[PDB]
Each structure stands twice: as C-alpha cells, then as structure tokens.
Amino acid sequence: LEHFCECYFNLSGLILCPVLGSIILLFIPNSRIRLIRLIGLCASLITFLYSLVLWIQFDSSTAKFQFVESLRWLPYENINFYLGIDGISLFFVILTTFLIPICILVGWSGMRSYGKEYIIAFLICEFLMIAVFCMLDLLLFYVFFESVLIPMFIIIGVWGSRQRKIKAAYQFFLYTLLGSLFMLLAILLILFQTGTTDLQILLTTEFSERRQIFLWIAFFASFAVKVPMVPVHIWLPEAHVEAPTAGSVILAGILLKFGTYGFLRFSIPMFPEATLCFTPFIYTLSAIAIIYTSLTTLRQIDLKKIIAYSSVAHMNLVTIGMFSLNIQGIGGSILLMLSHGLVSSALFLCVGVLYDRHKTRLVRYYGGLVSTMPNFSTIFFFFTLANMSLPGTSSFIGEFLILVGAFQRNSLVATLAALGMILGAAYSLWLYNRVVSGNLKPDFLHKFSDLNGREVFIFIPFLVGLVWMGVYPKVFLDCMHTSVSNLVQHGKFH
Amino acid sequence: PISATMVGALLGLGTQMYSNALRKLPYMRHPWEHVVGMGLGAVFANQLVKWDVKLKEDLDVMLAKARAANERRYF
Amino acid sequence: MNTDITALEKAQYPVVDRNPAFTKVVGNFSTLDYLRFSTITGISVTVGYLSGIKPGIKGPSMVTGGLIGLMGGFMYAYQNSAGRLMGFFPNDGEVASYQKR
Amino acid sequence: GGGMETNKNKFIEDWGSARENLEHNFRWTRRNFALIGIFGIALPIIVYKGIVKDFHMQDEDAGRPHRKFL
Amino acid sequence: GFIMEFAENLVLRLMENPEERDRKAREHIYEMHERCKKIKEMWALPIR
Amino acid sequence: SPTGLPAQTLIDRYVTVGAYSLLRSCTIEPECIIGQHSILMEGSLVETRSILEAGSVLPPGRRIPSGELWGGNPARFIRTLTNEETLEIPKLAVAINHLSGDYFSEFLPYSTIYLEVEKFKKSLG
Amino acid sequence: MFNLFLAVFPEIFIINATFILLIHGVVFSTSKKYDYPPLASNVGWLGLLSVLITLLLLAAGAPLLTIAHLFWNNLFRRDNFTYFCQIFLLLSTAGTISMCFDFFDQERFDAFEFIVLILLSTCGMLFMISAYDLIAMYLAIELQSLCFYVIAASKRKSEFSTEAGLKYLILGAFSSGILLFGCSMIYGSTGATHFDQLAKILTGYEITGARSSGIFMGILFIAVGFLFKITAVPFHMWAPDIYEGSPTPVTAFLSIAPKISIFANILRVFIYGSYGATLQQIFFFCSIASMILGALAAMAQTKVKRLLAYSSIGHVGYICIGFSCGTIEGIQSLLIGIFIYALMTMDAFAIVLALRQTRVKYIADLGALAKTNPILAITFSITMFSYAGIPPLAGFCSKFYLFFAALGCGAYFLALVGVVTSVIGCFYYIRLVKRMFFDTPRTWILYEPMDRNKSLLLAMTSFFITLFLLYPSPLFSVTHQMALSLYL
Numbered sequence A: 001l002e003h004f005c006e007c008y009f010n011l012s013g014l015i016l017c018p019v020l021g022s023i024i025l026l027f028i029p030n031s032r033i034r035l036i037r038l039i040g041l042c043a044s045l046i047t048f049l050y051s052l053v054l055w056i057q058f059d060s061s062t063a064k065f066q067f068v069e070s071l072r073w074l075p076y077e078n079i080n081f082y083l084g085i086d087g088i089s090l091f092f093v094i095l096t097t098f099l100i101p102i103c104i105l106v107g108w109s110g111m112r113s114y115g116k117e118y119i120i121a122f123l124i125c126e127f128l129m130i131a132v133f134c135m136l137d138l139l140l141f142y143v144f145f146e147s148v149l150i151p152m153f154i155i156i157g158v159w160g161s162r163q164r165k166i167k168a169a170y171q172f173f174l175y176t177l178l179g180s181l182f183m184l185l186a187i188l189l190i191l192f193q194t195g196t197t198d199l200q201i202l203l204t205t206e207f208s209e210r211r212q213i214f215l216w217i218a219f220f221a222s223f224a225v226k227v228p229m230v231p232v233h234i235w236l237p238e239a240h241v242e243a244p245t246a247g248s249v250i251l252a253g254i255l256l257k258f259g260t261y262g263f264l265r266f267s268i269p270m271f272p273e274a275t276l277c278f279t280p281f282i283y284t285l286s287a288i289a290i291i292y293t294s295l296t297t298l299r300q301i302d303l304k305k306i307i308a309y310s311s312v313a314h315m316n317l318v319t320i321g322m323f324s325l326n327i328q329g330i331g332g333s334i335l336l337m338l339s340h341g342l343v344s345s346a347l348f349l350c351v352g353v354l355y356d357r358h359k360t361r362l363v364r365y366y367g368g369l370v371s372t373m374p375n376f377s378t379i380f381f382f383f384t385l386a387n388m389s390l391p392g393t394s395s396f397i398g399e400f401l402i403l404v405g406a407f408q409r410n411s412l413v414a415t416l417a418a419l420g421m422i423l424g425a426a427y428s429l430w431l432y433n434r435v436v437s438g439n440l441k442p443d444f445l446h447k448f449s450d451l452n453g454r455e456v457f458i459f460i461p462f463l464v465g466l467v468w469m470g471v472y473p474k475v476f477l478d479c480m481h482t483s484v485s486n487l488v489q490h491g492k493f494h
Numbered sequence B: 001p002i003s004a005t006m007v008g009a010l011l012g013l014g015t016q017m018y019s020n021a022l023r024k025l026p027y028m029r030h031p032w033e034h035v036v037g038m039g040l041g042a043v044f045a046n047q048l049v050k051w052d053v054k055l056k057e058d059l060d061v062m063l064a065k066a067r068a069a070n071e072r073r074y075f
Numbered sequence C: 001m002n003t004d005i006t007a008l009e010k011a012q013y014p015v016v017d018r019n020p021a022f023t024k025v026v027g028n029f030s031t032l033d034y035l036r037f038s039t040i041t042g043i044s045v046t047v048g049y050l051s052g053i054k055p056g057i058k059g060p061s062m063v064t065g066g067l068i069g070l071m072g073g074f075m076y077a078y079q080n081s082a083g084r085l086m087g088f089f090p091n092d093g094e095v096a097s098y099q100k101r
Numbered sequence D: 001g002g003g004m005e006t007n008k009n010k011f012i013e014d015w016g017s018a019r020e021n022l023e024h025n026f027r028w029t030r031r032n033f034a035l036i037g038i039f040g041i042a043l044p045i046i047v048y049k050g051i052v053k054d055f056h057m058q059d060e061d062a063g064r065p066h067r068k069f070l
Numbered sequence E: 001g002f003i004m005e006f007a008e009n010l011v012l013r014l015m016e017n018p019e020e021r022d023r024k025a026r027e028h029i030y031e032m033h034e035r036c037k038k039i040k041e042m043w044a045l046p047i048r
Numbered sequence F: 001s002p003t004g005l006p007a008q009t010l011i012d013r014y015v016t017v018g019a020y021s022l023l024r025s026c027t028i029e030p031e032c033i034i035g036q037h038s039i040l041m042e043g044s045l046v047e048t049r050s051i052l053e054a055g056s057v058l059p060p061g062r063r064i065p066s067g068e069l070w071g072g073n074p075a076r077f078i079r080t081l082t083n084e085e086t087l088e089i090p091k092l093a094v095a096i097n098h099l100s101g102d103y104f105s106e107f108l109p110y111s112t113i114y115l116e117v118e119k120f121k122k123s124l125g
Numbered sequence G: 001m002f003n004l005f006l007a008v009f010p011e012i013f014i015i016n017a018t019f020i021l022l023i024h025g026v027v028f029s030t031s032k033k034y035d036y037p038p039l040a041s042n043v044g045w046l047g048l049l050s051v052l053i054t055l056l057l058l059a060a061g062a063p064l065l066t067i068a069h070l071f072w073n074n075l076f077r078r079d080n081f082t083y084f085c086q087i088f089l090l091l092s093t094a095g096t097i098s099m100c101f102d103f104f105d106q107e108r109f110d111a112f113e114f115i116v117l118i119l120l121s122t123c124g125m126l127f128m129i130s131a132y133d134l135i136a137m138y139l140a141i142e143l144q145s146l147c148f149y150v151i152a153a154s155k156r157k158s159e160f161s162t163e164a165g166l167k168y169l170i171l172g173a174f175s176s177g178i179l180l181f182g183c184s185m186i187y188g189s190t191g192a193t194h195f196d197q198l199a200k201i202l203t204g205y206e207i208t209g210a211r212s213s214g215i216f217m218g219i220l221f222i223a224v225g226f227l228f229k230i231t232a233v234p235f236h237m238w239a240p241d242i243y244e245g246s247p248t249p250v251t252a253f254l255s256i257a258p259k260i261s262i263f264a265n266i267l268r269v270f271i272y273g274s275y276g277a278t279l280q281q282i283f284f285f286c287s288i289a290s291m292i293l294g295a296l297a298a299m300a301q302t303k304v305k306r307l308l309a310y311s312s313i314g315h316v317g318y319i320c321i322g323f324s325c326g327t328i329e330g331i332q333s334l335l336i337g338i339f340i341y342a343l344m345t346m347d348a349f350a351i352v353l354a355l356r357q358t359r360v361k362y363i364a365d366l367g368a369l370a371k372t373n374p375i376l377a378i379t380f381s382i383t384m385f386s387y388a389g390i391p392p393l394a395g396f397c398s399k400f401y402l403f404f405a406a407l408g409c410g411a412y413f414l415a416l417v418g419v420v421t422s423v424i425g426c427f428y429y430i431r432l433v434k435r436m437f438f439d440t441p442r443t444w445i446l447y448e449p450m451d452r453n454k455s456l457l458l459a460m461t462s463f464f465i466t467l468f469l470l471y472p473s474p475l476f477s478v479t480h481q482m483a484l485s486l487y488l
C-alpha cells in the first residue's frame, strides 16, 4: 500500500540532504579546504531549516503518526517499510538536525588537518540518526541504529586526543553491538508470532503475559545498555571522554537518547503488562544509578569525566519518569531528554574550549579563570546552573515534571530521585568553583584567550534554547500531549 | 524519474572513478573509459531488472508445482 | 549404442526436427549465428594478439586465440541453430522455412 | 614562557593516570567482599523490597489484592 | 497583504488533510491484519 | 660516511627541505623543516621534530637533537621547540603537497612536443 | 548421435581449450628463438577468455544441458540447481584468474602450468556439481584435489609452499580414503550407487529399529570426508596451514570454488537422500564447533592470511546451520551465505593480493594505511565491517539467518553461541580498522598501487557489499528457485 503523503516537505528529502552532501564531498580535493567547509556547513544548515519547517506543518491534535510515507523494498510487497513521526519523536529529529552544524562549527579551526573525512562522518551520522528517529518498523530501527556504530567508531578512534581512545572505541563498539544483538533476537521472536515488523500493526496485536515477559527482557538488554543503566554504564565515561569534542556532543546529546526512545516507542506500548510487572525493577535500578553515579561524579578529577558521569544520573531520572506511565512522567522524560541534549552538549563544548587551548583535562591545573576568561566563565556558569536543574532553565521543567509523575505512583522512588537535586548541585558547583574561581596558577598556565566570535556564536543558540524551554515550555508540550496521552492509555480501555 | 538506466550509468561512472582512485590516479584520467563505464552500467542495470522479472515468473510456476504436490497429500 | 535425445524439459516452440543432422544444423546457420561466430572469433584473436606482445609471440598467440575462438564460436552457433530446429529456442524462421519446403 | 599548553607536573600526571587504571589494583579482599556484598547486593534488594511494599500498601489501602511483580 | 493572514493560509496549505491521513491509516491495518496470513503458508511448505 | 653508518641519503616523511639546500649522505628523521640555503654534510643526522634555520651549515657527522631549533654557520642550538611548533611541521608538509597538486594538474600524461619534432623533420626532408 | 553431446558442450569446450593452452605454453616456453618467454600471463589471459566462453555456452544453452537426460542419466544429472551452481563457479574462477597477473609479472612466477591446473580443477568442479552417483562424485572430487595438491606446492623451492603441499596431500588422501570406505559400505548394503536408487531404498525407513549399520556408517564416513572438504571443525586444521603456506592466488582460489562445488555435492547427496536426523545433527555439532574455534583462533592471529582462514572456518559454521535445520528456507539461506561469502572473500583477497606487491604479512603492517592510501583503507574497512555482519552491509544476511534459524527451531544454545561468536568476530575484524586508522606507528610501510584488474574487481565488489540490501530481490528469487529445484 503506497502511503505517500500530501505535504511538500516530507521525511525522505530530509533523509537525502546530508547524503547528497556526503556524495559531493567525496569528490572534492582536500586542497580545497574552504569549499569543503562551506559545503558541509551549508548542507547541515539546510537540513536544520527543513526540520524547522517540519515542525510548522505538525498537527498537535491527533494520536496518529504524521507525514507518514512508505518505502518499498521488494516487488512482492510482503515487506514494505514506513517512516513517520509523532509528538514524541519530532523534537528529537529537530535536536539532531540542530546539533550536527554545531559539530561542524566546533572543528572549523582544525579543518585543514581534519579533512573532508570529518565532515563526511558527521553527515553520515546525521543521516543515520534522523532515519532511526523516523522509523515505524522494529527491523529498520535495528538496522539504522547499528549503522551509526561504524562512523562513531571512526570518529572516536581517529580524532580522539590520546591513545586511550583505542580502548574507548573498542568498548563502545562491543557494548553497543551486544545490546543490539539482544534486540535483534527480540525482533525475530516478535516476527515469528506476527509475520511482520511494522510498528502500527504491533501496536494492535495482543501478546501473552508470558511472551511479553521474555520480549520485554530482550528489549531491556539493548535499551539498558543504551540508556545507560547500571551496571552496563561503564563504557560511557571512557567513550564520552576520549572522543573529540563534537564526537562527545553527538554521543551525549543524541546517541544516549536512543535507549529511552526505544523504551518510549516499543517496550511501553507493545508489552504493557510486562511494563507493569517490571516497574519496581526499573525504579530500583534507576534510583541506585542516580545516587551511586552522582556520588562517583563527586570524586572525579577530570573535567570530561565529571560531565560524562552527570549524564548517567540524568538519563536514569528520565527512565523513572517514563516508567511512571502518566502525563507528567512521560512529558517530563521527553522534555528532560531534549534539555539534556542541549545542556550536556554545551558543557562538553565548554570543556572543549578549555582543552583546545591548554590540552589538559585535569581539574587541578585550572583555577582563577574568571580573571582571564570572563566571557567563558559567565557562559560556563550558566550551563552549570542548567545542569543543576535551576528553575528558569529547561532542565528544571523536565526534572520537576518527572518527580510529579513518580510521586503519584510511588512516593519512595520520588524521594530517592529528588536526592539528585542535592548531589548534582554539589558536584556542579564544585567543578565550577575549582575551574573558574580562586587564583591563577601561573606555573601551570600563564597564557590565556577568551572566546572568539565563532565560540560565542556557537554558544548563543544553546542559551536561547535553554531559556526558551525553561520559561515557556508550552510550545513543546502542546505539540506532544496527544501522542503522550495515547502512549499512556495504550493497552487499557477505561 | 529514477530509471534503471540512470542508476546503472551513475554506478558505471562511479566504478571508473573508484578504480582510478584505488590506483592513486586522477579521477578523470582516461575519460573515454568513464563513457564506456556509464554505457556498461546502464546495460547491466536494465538487464538485471529484466532478469529479476523473469526470475519471479519462473519462481511462481515452481511454487505452484510445489503447492500442488503438497496438496496431493490430502486426497 | 542405444540413444535417446529426449530432454527433461520439453520444447516450448514447434519442433521442426527432433534430432537434426550435423550438416542440416550447419546449413541452418542464420545471419545472427554468423555474427555471433565472427564476433567471438574476432574478440579471441584480439585477446591473443594483445596478450602475446609482452612475451614476443603476438603472431602465434593470435593463432592460438583464434583457434579457441573459432571452436567456441562454432559451438555457440551450432547450439543456437540446433536449439531452434529442436524447438528449444524461438524459431520463427525455421517454422516459416518448414511450412513451405 | 612559550605556549598556551599547560606545563605538566609529573606527580599530578602520575596521580591522574593512577586514577585511570584502578581496575588493575582490585584484589578480592575481605573489605572489598563486604563492600560489594553490602552495596552491590543487599542495598539494591532492600530498595526493591521498599518500592514493592509501597505498591502493596497502596494496594491494600484501595481494597485490592497485592499486585504481582517481576 | 497582512503578514499573518498570509502566514495562516500558507501554514494550512503545508499541512496534511486530516481526513485522508486518518483513512489510509485504516486501509493499512485492515489490509495488514487480513494480509498477515499469506507468507506464513510458504514457511510451512515441506522441504521434502 | 665518516660515522661508519650507511651513507644513503634518507629524507623521511613529512620533511620540508627549503629551497637552495645541499644534502649529501644525511638522514632527516620524520617531521623536520630544513631552512632555505642550508647545507647538510656526510653522515649528519637531523632527529625528528627539529627545525634548522635558513643558512645553516651542518658539518660531517654532526647531529641535530630532536625537538630543537638550530641555526648558524656552523649550526648551534638556539632554543627548544614548543609542542605547538612541532605540531605545525606535518601541516607545512601537507600544505606544500596541496600546492604541488596544482602543478601536477597542469600536465597531461604525454606532451605534444613530438609533433613539433615531426614537422621540424619534415621541413628538412 | 552428435546432438546428444549438447548436454556437455560447456565441458567439451573448456577441456579442449585447456589442451590447446597446454600445447601452446609448452611449445613456446621451450623456444630458444623466442628466448624462452614467460607465458603465465599470456596463457592466463587466454584461459580467462576460455572461462568466459564456457560461461557463455553454459548460460545461453540452459534447456540444451538437459537434452538426452536418459542417455546421460547413469553419468550425471543437469538441472536448474546445477545450472546456477556451475555459472557461479565459472564466475568465481574468472575473477580469481583476473587477480593473478600482477603476481605473474612482478614476482615472476613464469609457470603457465599453474593456469592449466586451475582450468583442469575447474573442469573437475563442474563435473562435481552435476555428479549424481557416488563413483562420479568421488572421481570429480579426486581430480579437483590432485590439482590443488600440485598448485599448493607450486613454489617448489619455498619451505612454506612445500610444507603446505605435504600436509595437504597426506590429510587429503586420508580423508578421501575415509569417504571411499563410506561409499563401499553403502554399495555393499544397498546394491546401488546412483543417487536416485539410494533415494528410493533409504526413504521411508531412516532408523526403523532394524537399521542397516552398513548404511549408517557409510553415511558417517562420507560425511566425514565432506566435512574435511568444507573445513568444518574437527576436520579443519589442514586449512589454516595450507591457506597460509600456499601462494596467495592459490589461497584465494581454494577459499571459494571448492566450497561451491562440495556444497552442491552435499545438498544433492544428503538433502536428496535419506538417513536424516543423525546427519543434520552431525552438521549441527560441527557448525557450533566451527563457529567457536574459528572465533577464538582468529582472535589469536597476528597475520592476515591466517586470520582470513579462521574467518572462513567460522563462516562455514554459520552456513552449515542452514543445512542443519532441514527446510527450504534453510537451503536458501545456505546458498545466500555462500554467494555473499564468496563475493566478500574475492574482495578481501583482491586487497591482499594488491598489498602482497609490498609483501604484507602482519596485521601491524597495515599501520597508517588511512594516510598512505585513504580510499584503499576505507574499502578494506567496508570488507571488515561486512565480515563482522554490521548492517546494512551484505554480510548482515548470514547473521540474520543464523538467529532466524535458532529462534524458530527452538535452539537457544545456538543463539547464545551466535551472539558470543559474533561479538568476538566483530572485535577481531575492527582491530584491522583500528590498525589502519587509529594507530601512529614510528615506521610506515608504503604500498605500491594495485593494477587495473584488481581495482575494477574491488570497485564492483565494494558497491555490491554496500548496496546489495537496496536491491536483493534477484539473489533471493534465484536461491529460492535453486532450493526448490533439488526436489522438483
């Protein structure tokens, strides 16, 4: 059945944009550095504007999928694949399209040595990740998620700073592939019942409570590695620290969101009974992760290691929210996913600004930077506040909505999750004051430069987005409520 | 639109360029070879499409015979 | 020696001659058969010449390639002509010539 | 004198690299057994039993049987 | 003329027809619930 | 060579040999810059990530230690290089290769001089 | 009478052309006048031509190959399955030959007899595919094997090549004797060697209590010979040593064509015959053993050739899982896995042969390849990721069917083993990518650019590997067709 959509701007062209950029860049000599830089930047910016348009034509009243279009693999038409979005996936497409040009801009100064391979890898990542977020089929979700492993592996291994990138890349690839294989096993078990992998159909089939338990575990084994949940979180610090700055931005801001997106998109609505049965288990794992990882964060001595550990606590709060299974919980989980994608990316950008000049991640070398880099200090303080969920910032909305959702289900889990307010403040303020406050240490660092124009411009949209979601989250929540409501209700008829 | 001829011509041109690159030669070292490659790729792609149609046609009859042989069991 | 030409898969075109004689098959060669024959032989001679230059035997290499091409091209033309007479290949010309003589 | 790069201190780098390679130091000692038994098994089990009881106490407050889990 | 009235009209022209979008959605399911039987018959074909 | 080591001239990777330079049976380790109008004599050795100033003279069997800037006639230690400077050396080599690409693209595989030779011959019978 | 031989036109042509090339080579290689020219490349080009003409004759005469089937019945059996098997075998032989010319001229391997032996082994494998009797099968297998023994020892002054040949001949002869013993037991128990007669006798009884121990052990011994041939564990250890010690073009040829021919044989013997669950269990246990041992041993390797050998052992384990589950989809998946593994192996050995011009030996010799030849490092990386089975590369098909067969048949231990071994394989495949892209060695090896033949072959196989799953319908249809034609 051809499900071709009426809209002019659709999903397939947004898929095709970075692909065309990559093919063009394949054939341009490395001597033409300016041309390569401009072509990559412009392709990414056009993709971002295309996604913004897709946001305008979005219809915030339906529980259905939108812009649905189809994609036909065999003339037999037994296997035909669909793309479409809703109010849970729209902003993730937008976030991906927004972050990719930021990645191209962060490496602007070093592009003469980076080459076209850097831009091509990031464009391919963009294409694959947008595809992943736009897929109405378990099997293609699988295929497009595993595909990102190759360019991410290359990005970490080639442009990482030091030789620990070897181990970091190995661990990233192997952990993620193990999880992916588990979810492939789940996909095949589903296919044996249903004869299909189309998401819309699986949302309308009934699974046995028993078959649901096994399928839920097999989904959990991928998703908990992706989130990450303890104790399969240890790949994340190594990988997110050893990666280049833009690589860390993509890893934390987008790739981490894929596990929570998988929970929201397949596990909760397809197996509601198993979702109910496992809820105490998820609550326990997430609460343990928040407390233990926050306390580990407190004792880290590397800038990137502190920012990377912080992401584990934030994502497990997201899981608590989404498994609360109400409007506050799921809405807050999605809002915190987007806000984290902005805030952690900005924090990695701040650390990258420091590392590009001074080539150290050890906190002890820095100090007193407020007197030589006041602009960087102010921006760093703002994003530090955002990482503490300060009211007025975007992260507070999601954090408090998730606590609201959890409290209505289980007051103990909400109480353990609200401890994050105390621990995250502690490590965020300690980091900021050890880096920026105090006196300079001229025996380690004596030469300084505040942000140039490119760095200031890079930070501006992050600031605008954080404040915008913090003060008026209605623009986002209005487009999401129908989808969130239908997700919450799926499986029940009262 | 996107015809087999165009896909095949693009693949043949890409093949010549990829071959040149692998040999550390300029992309357009022997351009008449690029023309030859576009022609061969177009021909190959069109023949693959026709072959695919013929293959489905033969598989249909063969599955029909398999089904008849299986249905003979319940007689 | 007992013989049986009967094939496993039956002919899908009218059978002009079930087991045509060798000379009948050769005399049945059409223009397309000769084109196939000549093309295969010419390509083979060309390959013989080009591959023979480096060893210095381009002439004898041409002869060897030409022998291979002659045998292969004749076998291919015979295959086509016999298959047409037997009804295994489209044989409009054979049927037309048969319905008249 | 020359450069924005930090002037490395050997002891600070030794401290950092020792932090990065802690897994080579793990010995299954008595203290480590106790710490993994208490914080890696017992406390998560206690938290899980707390969360479940919370739901069961809600269940009996609503005049409903205990919800089965896991 | 006015910016916003033009913008109103332009945005509505961009958007899916909600009626048609919700109707192909029904054809996919009705066709897929009753179409899910054909392929599983081939997987049960005896190899011998 | 006077040092007894083998006397081939080895210019390793990412090495920039400045214009008007004279090299005889010297070794240049990877990622070095030789200044313009320099002289490197028999058996001399330039260790990796080192820079010689323009007009330097390195006598037979002399060595330029790694990570250092040298210069003079004869060459003498000037200062130790920073890590940023040593990072710049392969960049200079790559940039010069990029420039050489433009010259490489001006020449087809064959010249047309043989035609001129042909007509010059024909005008002579 | 003459028209009866239309069923063997392809084979007649290739044999006659091989004789012509033998005479040409021996006459002019001994010529003082021509100063004893090397003829390996000249004969190689003429033999590539001969292979392509054979392919034309076979492909264009599809119905004619079945002519006079009653007259030829006690000698061979040609059908749809043998048709496509033989086409794929000829295509593989043509590619392998095309990859040999730089080796001929730069090493100066002047022996044209190498090409003749390859062509005669191709004749043997052609007859293997159409064999329909134990006697014919054994004879064709032996012809193929003797040709390999000779070419494995072609570097006759090399310690490695002579060692390879000696190990191959001894272990090959032993396994062939075991298989022949099995054939003798089956004949003695049934009075038959033709596959049709064996099918009629053995069907409907399998092990009905009063089982012919003669029939049961004949099957077992024949299976042991077959498993030796496909390098299945525990009959595998010849393969890594022979693969490493033989000349690299020999290693490339052995890695592909014999597998095609012997799986044709295995399908038509076992699948078409009847002892049953015992033999599928044989291939089950050997598949699991091959996957585990291939993964671990490949992880141990520091040299490229040995790594590829152990990789092929693991992949034949993956393929034999399809034979084990005994369904039309199992056979189809086995065929798809052979096709895709063959094209990936051709790609990998084209790269290896290109790098052998600078004597690549160790994985570490690939260091800085992403700098000295970026497009070559990317191409080799695509091959590795395809070997690892990362989607949407072509290699993902074998992993997908491995888990598809386990989940359905109820085999959870097989799925477990597949997950573990797939992760191990991915590690040792991406180790190569790390070596080419992430490492910064002090000494680099600069490689000479490859010839046109290998660049073109690499370019086409690299597009196939990246783009196959955009248009996989022809392979899917052709392999379903073949699986069905085994019984109808």
Ligand SMILES: CCCCCCCCCCCCCCCCCC(=O)O[C@@H](COC(=O)CCCCCCCCCCCCCCC)COP(=O)(O)OCC[N+](C)(C)C
Binding pocket: A023, A026, A027, A116, A117, A118, A120, A121, A124, A128, A147, A148, A150, A151, A154, B010, B011, B013, B014, B015, B017, B018, B020, B021, B022, B024, B025, B026, B027, G373, G374, G375, G376, G378, G391, G392
């Ligand atoms: C999304 C897939 C799943 C994930 C897998 C990803 C696998 C790749 C990993 C991604 C990370 C980054 C990869 C970087 C590669 C990009 C750089 C690159 O390959 O550039 C090549 C370009 O390589 C190629 O040649 C690619 C050719 C493939 C052709 C495919 C296109 C087919 C149709 C195009 C038609 C022709 C062009 C049309 C417009 C003119 C340049 O090669 P060099 O070795 O640097 O120099 C070549 C020599 N010379 C320039 C002088 C010619």
Ligand SMILES: CCCCCCCCCCCCCCCCCCCC(=O)O[C@H](COC(=O)CCCCCCCCCCCCCC)COP(=O)(O)OCCN
Binding pocket: B032, B033, B035, B036, F109, F110
């Ligand atoms: C219609 C566009 C495409 C037509 C292509 C030609 C017609 C098709 C015939 C088959 C062509 C196949 C490709 C031929 C070249 C194959 C590779 C040969 C390269 C080689 O190594 O040998 C060279 C022989 O040159 C050669 O083999 C080439 C010899 C002369 C052919 C070039 C003329 C092509 C005409 C294109 C259009 C002309 C318009 C007017 C009709 C010697 O190389 P070298 O020493 O000579 O120099 C090379 C400077 N790197």
Ligand SMILES: CCCCCCCCCCCCCCCCCCCC(=O)O[C@H](COC(=O)CCCCCCCCCCCCCC)COP(=O)(O)OCCN
Binding pocket: A230, A231, A288, D026, D027, D028, D029, D036, D039, D040, D041
């Ligand atoms: C309700 C149970 C749920 C499942 C939990 C796991 C299974 C239960 C626990 C198994 C305990 C096995 C027996 C341990 C006690 C015997 C001690 C003997 C002496 C000893 O120290 O032996 C060590 C053996 O350690 C070992 O073999 C290590 C023991 C295994 C530890 C299991 C840890 C589980 C995961 C922890 C939590 C992770 C998630 C937290 C959020 C090696 O001594 P050595 O001499 O080599 O020492 C280095 C010296 N140079």
Ligand SMILES: CCCCCCCCCCCCCCCCCCCC(=O)O[C@H](COC(=O)CCCCCCCCCCCCCC)COP(=O)(O)OCCN
Binding pocket: B011, B012, B015, B016, B033, B034, B036, B037, B038, B040, B041, B044, G091, G092, G094, G095, G096, G098, G101, G343, G346, G451, G452, G453, G454, G456, G457, G459, G460, G461, G463, G464
């Ligand atoms: C399916 C995925 C997508 C695929 C894309 C399909 C597109 C079609 C391909 C288009 C090709 C583009 C280039 C065409 C122009 C080049 C013409 C070749 C020139 C030529 O005569 O080459 C000779 C060598 O032969 C050669 O180099 C030819 C042999 C190359 C090997 C390939 C054929 C081998 C046999 C079949 C293999 C099948 C394997 C599969 C199992 C002489 O070259 P030179 O003059 O430079 O001198 C080399 C030094 N001796």
